[PDB]
A paper describes a structure:
[name] ([name]) catalyzes the first step in the guanine nucleotide de novo biosynthetic pathway, at the bifurcation of the guanine and adenine routes, which share the precursor [name]. An [name] monomer consists of a catalytic TIM barrel (light blue) and a regulatory Bateman domain (dark blue), which is not required for catalytic activity but is essential for allosteric regulation. The basic units of [name] are tetramers that dimerize to form octamers upon nucleotide binding. In contrast to the eukaryotic enzymes, bacterial IMPDHs only contains two canonical allosteric binding sites in their Bateman domains.
After multiple cocrystallization trials, we were able to obtain the structure of PaIMPDH bound to both ATP and GDP at 1.65 Å resolution. The two monomers in the asymmetric unit (AU) contained well‐defined electron density in the Bateman domain that could be unequivocally attributed to ATP and GDP bound to the canonical Sites 1 and 2, respectively, as well as a magnesium atom coordinated by their β‐ and γ‐phosphates. The binding modes of ATP and GDP in the canonical sites are identical to those observed in the structures of eukaryotic IMPDHs, 6 , 13 , 14 , 34 where the nucleotide's phosphate groups position close together at the interface of two opposing Bateman domains. The recognition of the adenine ring of ATP bound to the canonical Site 1 (ATP1) was mainly due to hydrogen bonds from the backbone carbonyl atoms of residues V159 and K181 and N6 nitrogen atom of the adenine. Additionally, ATP1 γ‐phosphate coordinated a Magnesium atom, together with the β‐phosphate of GDP bound to the canonical Site 2 (GDP2) and the carboxylic acid in the side chain of residue E180. In the canonical Site 2, GDP2 guanine ring was sandwiched between the hydrophobic side chains of residues F118 and V94, with the hydroxyls of the ribose moiety tightly coordinated to the carboxylic acid of the absolutely conserved residue D199. 35 The negative charge of GDP2 phosphate groups was counteracted by the basic side chains of residues K181 and R198, as well as a Magnesium atom. Monomers in the AU are related by noncrystallographic symmetry axes that allow to reconstruct [name] octamers within the crystal lattice. These octamers are assembled as dimers of tetramers that pile up tail‐to‐tail, forcing the finger domains of opposing tetramers to interact and placing their catalytic sites close together to inhibit the catalytic activity. Remarkably, no electron density surrounding the area corresponding to the eukaryotic noncanonical Site 3 is observed in the inhibited PaIMPDH structure, suggesting that, in contrast to eukaryotic IMPDHs, the occupancy of the canonical Site 2 by GTP/GDP (when ATP is bound at the canonical Site 1) is necessary and sufficient to induce compact octamers and, subsequently, inhibit the activity of PaIMPDH and EcIMPDH.
Numbering used by the authors:
A (entry chain B): 1 to 371, 381 to 388, 416 to 479
B (entry chain A), C (entry chain A): 1 to 373, 381 to 387, 416 to 480
C-alpha cells in the first residue's frame, strides 16, 4: 500500500470567508501569547537568522509589541552580549548603574562615556553617594585638578529620591530641577539606582512594547543540541534572556526532547520554546517534555531546501491546524514559522490556530536587520539569496498588522482568541488563487 | 553648403592620460568657485529640479561643501520660505531670535516650540531682557501661575556675554554654567543675539560647510524670465539667498541676457548665474551682461529630450571647453550642468574647464531629496518622467563622487582644482576603447 | 583649448594584414623575454590576483613555459611561503634535503612525511651520513625497535655519487640499483645533496618549463609601496623569488619610481618589474629607475572600473606601441597587462610591441586557480566582483591561446617573436569591420 496519511493544505489552497462584523479593523485587539508565560501585544516574532535578528532588530521588534530571537551562528559571549544589549536598552530603573569615585581621572570618564554611549555616572565612596557627573559636566576643563571631584555636581546639590518613591513623584522632581537623572538612595544615602528621563520618554513612545517586570525589553535567543549547548544556555540566561529557543530542523527527536527537558530542569525560571515540528504527535511530545511553546514548520521557509533535498515536509496550514488541535486545552502556544509571503498568509495562519507567526524574509533587508541586503538559509538544506532594502522595520510591521486587522474585521473577529477559533475557510483551486492576485492589468 | 561648425565630443569620447604624480588622492585640494564671489570646498551643485533640491537637500549639499539650487516649480512665498529654511538652519549667532513676554501663556509657548522646532526664547518685556525660557523649563507645571514668568530663568540668574566677546570665552562660560544658550547683550543689557551649543557643534561637525559671512549655510534659487520674475527675485533676496540662478532652456536670448543685467543692477549684493548655454559667443554675452557665473549644458541632461524634440545641442565635453576658452581671464566661472553618469565623467568635465558640476539624476532618490519612496525623477515638452533607485544618504553618493575625482587628480598629478582644469590631457577614443574601459566579458556578482 | 594628445586605439580597432609566408604555425618560435634577465618559452604571464595566481597556478604556468606572479592580498610570511612552494616544487638537485637521525621515532617521521609530501630522508647523526629511509621503508613494522635505525637502509648499502658526476652516469646507477634517490657526497662522504627520479622525469615531461640556474621553476611576486613593502621584498627574495613586481594602479609616481630604484639597489640579484603605466614618459622614468621590465595597462582590465570611476586610461593597443617606441634600444621588455579577451587580441598586442602578455580573467576558473567551484573573479573602489565559468585545466586554455598566436604568426610570415613584434602591419577598421570579423548572421550550435 502507498501509505498516505492525509491531503495537506498550504496558504494558497484556502481563503477566509467574510462574516458578519460589528468591530472595525482599527478597534480589534491583537494581543496574544508567545509562550505560557510571555504575552505579546502583536503576534509577530523575528526569526533566529544571521541576516535577520541581532540586538538592533530585536530591540525594534520588542518596541513594536512583538519579539526577536537572536540567532546562534556566533560565539557564546557574542550571543550573550547581543541579549545584554536588548535587556539594557531601557528599564524602569537602572539598578546597577556604572559608577565612578571622586579620585577617578576625568580622562577615564571621557573614555567610559565613549565606550558606553552614555555620560551619566553617579559618584560613590564605598557605596555612599557623594556626587554625580554627566555629559554637560564633562565639557568643563577645570581650573585645577584632573579628577571627577573637580567637575562633578557635589553632594550638597544632589537631587535624590528614596527607594520606593512613585515614578510620577520622581518625574515632578526631575522637571522642577531641570535635570534628566534621578538618583535613588536608601535611608543612609547609599546609592540604590538611577532613573533617566530617556527611559521615561521611551516608555511613553512605545506603550505597546514587550517588557518584563523590570521594564526591560523582552528578547529570545536560539540554541541547538551540540556540545556547547549547555554552556551557551547558561550564558544566555545569565545575560537576562526571556526565552530560550531550542531550534533544530527536527524537533520530534530524542536530542531535542532531551535538551528541552534539560533546560526546564536546570533553568526553571526561563521560558523554553521547542521546534521545529509539523505533527500532532510531535506537539504532544514537546509539551510533555515541558516546552512553554512549540514552533511549527518543516519545509515552508522561503529559502528552505528541506522539502527538495530530503523530500520531507508538511504544508503549513494543515501543520498548524494539526498542532493546534493536539494542544487544545493544554495552555501551550504554537508559533507558525515559515512560508509567510503576504499579510494575507499571516491572517490565514492565525485562523488555522497559530498564536503568533515567525518571519525571516519579510524582515531581512530592513534598516535594523544585520548587514539589496543578504538573506541566506542557516543550513545543505538552505540557499543564499538577495532581498531588496526595505527601510525601517516599523513600516513593514504596520502593513502586516494592517492586513491582519482587515482580516479580523472581514471575519467579525474582535480579538485573537476569536480569530483563532471562529472564522472559516473555503478551499479553492489553482484558478481561485489566480483570481485573487492582480490579474489582466499592467501594474 | 552643409554648415558644420565643428566635430563635438562628449564624455565617452575621451579619457584622461595618466601623468607623473607626487600627491596622493587623499591629499589633493578640491576647493573651487561657484561664482565670482562664492567659493565651494567641493565642486558639486545640486540641480534646480522638484525631484532633487528643496531645503532639506540644499542643507545637506552645503554641509558637504557644495550648494543646492532650490527649484522654482512652486509659489513665490513658498520658494522664499525654502531659502529661509536653509539660511536659518545654522548661524554663528542668532541676531533676531524669537522672543516672548513674561505674560505669555505656557500652553501657547509649548505649541510655538512645536511649530518652530526649537524651545529657547529670550524673555523681553517692553524693551528689557528679563529672563530666558527653554525646553527644560517648559516641562515644569508651576505650583501657581500659567505664564512664562512662572518657569523662566529670571534676570538675576541670566548668563550673558557682551557683544564682541570672542567665541572661545563665550564657550567657556557656557560650559562652566552647564547651559547651551548664551545671551549676547550690549553695554545697557539690551538683547543683541543668541548663541547656541547646537550651532557651535554643527560648525565643528561640518568644517567644510559652505557658509556666508554670518556663518549661515549658502543656498541658491532658480528664477525664469516670466512676468512674476521681478517679485520672485525680490522675495528670494529678502529671504537671504546667496545666488540667483536665471535658469532657462536657452540663455543666449534677449530674455535671459536682460534679466541677468537687471538682477546685477537692481540687487548688486547678490550673486547671479545665467544659463543654460553651450557656445563661446553665449558665454561672452552673459559675462558682458554681468553674470557672476554661467551654466553650460544644452541637451545632455539625463531626462532631457531637447536634442530629440528640437534637434538642438552641443556634446558636453566640447561645450565646456569652448565656454572655458571664451571666459579665460575674465574671472567668470562656468558650471557644467548635465550628462554626468559616473564619477569619471565629473573628472573629465573638470579637465575640460568646468569650475564645478551640477547634477540632478544622481541626487534624485536620496533620503534628502523631495518625494516619497524607487523615487520619482522627471524633467522640468522637452523632458520625460521616470524612476531612479532609492539611494540612501546623500553623503555616501558625494563621498564616491569625490573619491573618483580625487583618484583622477592623483592619476594626472593635479594637486588642486586649478591644476586639474588647466594641465592634464585627454586621448580621443573609439567605441571599442569605451567598451574596453567598461567592465567587459565577465559575469558581475 | 580642449587638450587632446592623440586618438588612441584598442584591440577591436585593428586587424593584422596577412603577408607572404614560408613558415607554418607549428614551426614558429614563441620564445621571448619577461625581463632583462628572464626568458620565457611562451609569452604568457598570469596576473597577481587572489582569484588567479597562488603557488598551484604559478607552478602550472612555469611548466607551460610562462610564469605566474603571486598576489599580495595575504600576510608577508604567507606570500613568501607560496613562493617557496613554487621554488621547491622541482629542482636539478635538492641541496638542503630534510634529514633525520637514527634515533628519530618512526611514528614521528610518518607524520612529517604526511606534512612534507615526500617520504625520502637521508639519515645523519652528528655530521655523518649513516643511512637513508624512504616511503617503502616506512611501511615496515620492525621486529624490534621503533626508530629510523630499525628500518633505514644502512651506510654499507647506500648508493652514492660524487659531486660533479654527470647526470647521465647518476641515472645509470639509479636504474641499475632499482632506486629512485641518489645521495650526492663529497670526497669525505659528507652529504651535499639528493637527486630524485621524480625531478628527472618532471624535467623530461615539461622540457619547455621556465626554470632558473638550479633547475627550479621560476616565479614572481607582487609588492606595493606601503609601509611593509621593504620587509615583504626581503622575505620574498629570501624565499627565492625570481622577479619582484612593484605593482600599483599608477606606476608613473614618486612612490613606485623610488621603490623600484630601492629594490634594484638593495637586491641587485633579483629582477624587478614596475607598473602599471601607459605612456612613453612613464616607461622612460621606470627604465631610468632601473626597472628590468615595465607593465603596461591603465584601464583595460576585464574587472577594471578605473576608466569609469576616475575617467582615466589609454586604449591598450596605442599604450603598448607608445611604450614600445619609448623603450626601443634600451633592452627593457614591456608586459601587456589587461584587456585580452580572445587569442586574437594577444597576437595584436605582440605586433604592437609587447614582449609578453599578462592575463587574469582568462585564467580565473581553471582547476589550478585559487577558490572553490563557476569560479569567483574579482578586482583587487576601482574594481568589481564577478563570476567566470569553470574552465578545467590551465593547459587547455594555454594551448588554444598559443595556437591562435601561432596561426597569426603564420598568417603574417613571422618566424619568431622578434619578427612578430617588428614587421607585421595593421589595418584600421570601423565597427562594421569588427562585426564582419565576429561570427554573424548564423545560429551557433
Ligand atoms: N540628580 C541630580 N542632582 C543634582 N544635579 C544633577 C542631577 N542629575 C544631573 N545633574 C546635573 O545637572 C546638569 C545636567 O545634567 P543632566 O543629566 O540633566 O543632562 P546631561 O545629560 O548632562 O545634558 P544633555 O542631555 O543636554 O546632553 C549637570 O551639571 C549634572 O551634574
Ligand atoms: N543664558 C542662560 N542664562 C541662565 N540660564 C539659562 C541660560 N540658558 C539656559 N538657561 C537655563 O538652563 C536650563 C537648561 O537650559 P538649556 O538651554 O541649557 O537646555 P534645554 O534646551 O532646556 O535642554 P535640552 O537641550 O537638554 O533639551 C533651563 O532652566 C534654562 O532656563
Ligand atoms: N641511494 C640509495 N641507496 C641505497 N638504498 C636506497 C637509496 N635510495 C632508496 N633506497 C632504498 O630502496 C628502497 C626503495 O626506495 P625508493 O626511494 O627507490 O622508493 P620509495 O619512494 O621508497 O617507493 P615508491 O616511490 O614506490 O613509493 C628503500 O628500501 C630505500 O631505503
Ligand atoms: N547612566 C546610565 N545609563 C544606563 C546604564 N545602563 C543602561 N543605561 C541606559 O542608557 C540610557 C542613558 O540615556 P541618557 O540618560 O539620556 O544618557 P546621557 O544623558 O547621555 O548620559 C538610558 O536608557 C539608561 O537606561 C548605566 O549604567 N548608566
Ligand atoms: N533659539 C532660537 N534658535 C533658532 C532661531 N532661529 C534659528 N534657530 C536655530 O535653531 C537651533 C536650535 O537648536 P537648540 O538651541 O539646540 O534648540 P533647543 O535647545 O531645543 O531650543 C539652532 O541651530 C539655532 O541657530 C531662534 O529664533 N531662536
Ligand atoms: N626528499 C626530498 N624531496 C624534496 C625536498 N624538498 C623538495 N623535494 C621534492 O619533493 C619531490 C619528492 O619526490 P619523490 O622523490 O618521488 O618523493 P618520495 O619518493 O615520496 O619521497 C621531489 O620533486 C623533490 O625535488 C626534501 O627536502 N627532500
Ligand atoms: O536553511 C535553512 N534550512 C531550513 N529551514 C530554514 C533555513 N533557514 C531558515 N529556515 C527556516 O525558515 C524560516 C524563515 O522563513 P521565511 O519567513 O519564509 O523566510 C526560519 O524561521 C526557519 O524556521
Ligand atoms: O526637461 C528638461 N529639458 C531639458 N533639460 C532639462 C530638463 N529638466 C532638467 N534638465 C537639465 O538636466 C540637468 C540634470 O541632468 P542630469 O544630472 O543628467 O540628471 C538639470 O540640471 C537641467 O539643466
Ligand atoms: O580592480 C582593479 N582596478 C584596476 N585594474 C585591475 C584591478 N584588478 C586587476 N586589475 C588589472 O586587470 C588585469 C587583469 O585583466 P583581465 O586579463 O582583462 O582580466 C590585472 O593583471 C591588473 O593589471
Ligand atoms: K484580485
Ligand atoms: K575595464
Ligand atoms: K567572421
Ligand atoms: Mg543627557
Ligand atoms: Mg536644548
Ligand atoms: Mg617514492
Amino acid at each position: 500500500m502507498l501509505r498516505i496519511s492525509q491531503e495537506a493544505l498550504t496558504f494558497d489552497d484556502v481563503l477566509l470567508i467574510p462574516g458578519y462584523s460589528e468591530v472595525l479593523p482599527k478597534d480589534v485587539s491583537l494581543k496574544t501569547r508567545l509562550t505560557r508565560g510571555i504575552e505579546l501585544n502583536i503576534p509577530l516574532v523575528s526569526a533566529a537568522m544571521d541576516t535577520v535578528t541581532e540586538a538592533r532588530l530585536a530591540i525594534a521588534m520588542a518596541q513594536e509589541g512583538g519579539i526577536g530571537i537572536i540567532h546562534k551562528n556566533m560565539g557564546i559571549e557574542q550571543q550573550a552580549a547581543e541579549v545584554r544589549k536588548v535587556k539594557k536598552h531601557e528599564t524602569a530603573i537602572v539598578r546597577d548603574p556604572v559608577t565612578v569615585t571622586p579620585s577617578t581621572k576625568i580622562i577615564e570618564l571621557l573614555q567610559m562615556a565613549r565606550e558606553y554611549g552614555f555620560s551619566g555616572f553617579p559618584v560613590v565612596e564605598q557605596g555612599e553617594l557623594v556626587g554625580i557627573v554627566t555629559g554637560r559636566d564633562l565639557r568643563v576643563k577645570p581650573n585645577a585638578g584632573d579628577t571627577v571631584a573637580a567637575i562633578m555636581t557635589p553632594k550638597d546639590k544632589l537631587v535624590t529620591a528614596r527607594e520606593g518613591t512613585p515614578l510620577e513623584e520622581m518625574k515632578a522632581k526631575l522637571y522642577e530641577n531641570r535635570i534628566e537623572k534621578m538618583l535613588v538612595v536608601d535611608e543612609n544615602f547609599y546609592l540604590r539606582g538611577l532613573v533617566t528621563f530617556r527611559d521615561i520618554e521611551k516608555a511613553k513612545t512605545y506603550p505597546l512594547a514587550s517588557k518584563d517586570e523590570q521594564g526591560r525589553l523582552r528578547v529570545g535567543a536560539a540554541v541547538g543540541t551540540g556540545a556547547d549547548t549547555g554552556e551557551r544556555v547558561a550564558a544566555l540566561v545569565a545575560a537576562g534572556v526571556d526565552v530560550v529557543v531550542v531550534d533544530t530542523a527536527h524537533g520530534h527527536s530524542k536530542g531535542v526532547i532531551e535538551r528541552v527537558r534539560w533546560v526546564k530542569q536546570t533553568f526553571p525560571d526561563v521560558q523554553v520554546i521547542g521546534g521545529n515540528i509539523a505533527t500532532a504527535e510531535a506537539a504532544k511530545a514537546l509539551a510533555e517534555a515541558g516546552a512553554d511553546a512549540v514552533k511549527v514548520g518543516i519545509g515552508p521557509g522561503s529559502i528552505c531546501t528541506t522539502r527538495i533535498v530530503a523530500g520531507v515536509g508538511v504544508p503549513q496550514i494543515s501543520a498548524i491546524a494539526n498542532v493546534a488541535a493536539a494542544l487544545e486545552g493544554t495552555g501551550v502556544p504554537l508559533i507558525a514559522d515559515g512560508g509567510i509571503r503576504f499579510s494575507g498568509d499571516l491572517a490565514k495562519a492565525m485562523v488555522a490556530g497559530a498564536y503568533c507567526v515567525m518571519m525571516g524574509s519579510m524582515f531581512a533587508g530592513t534598516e535594523e536587520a544585520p548587514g539589496y541586503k543578504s538573506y541566506r538559509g542557516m543550513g545543505p538544506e538552505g540557499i543564499e539569496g538577495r532581498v531588496p532594502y526595505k527601510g525601517a522595520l516599523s513600516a513593514i510591521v504596520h502593513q502586516l498588522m494592517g492586513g491582519l486587522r482587515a482580516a479580523m474585521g472581514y471575519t467579525g473577529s474582535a480579538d485573537i482568541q476569536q480569530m483563532r477559533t471562529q472564522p472559516q475557510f473555503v478551499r479553492i483551486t489553482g484558478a481561485g488563487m489566480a483570481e485573487s492576485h492582480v490579474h489582466d492589468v499592467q501594474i
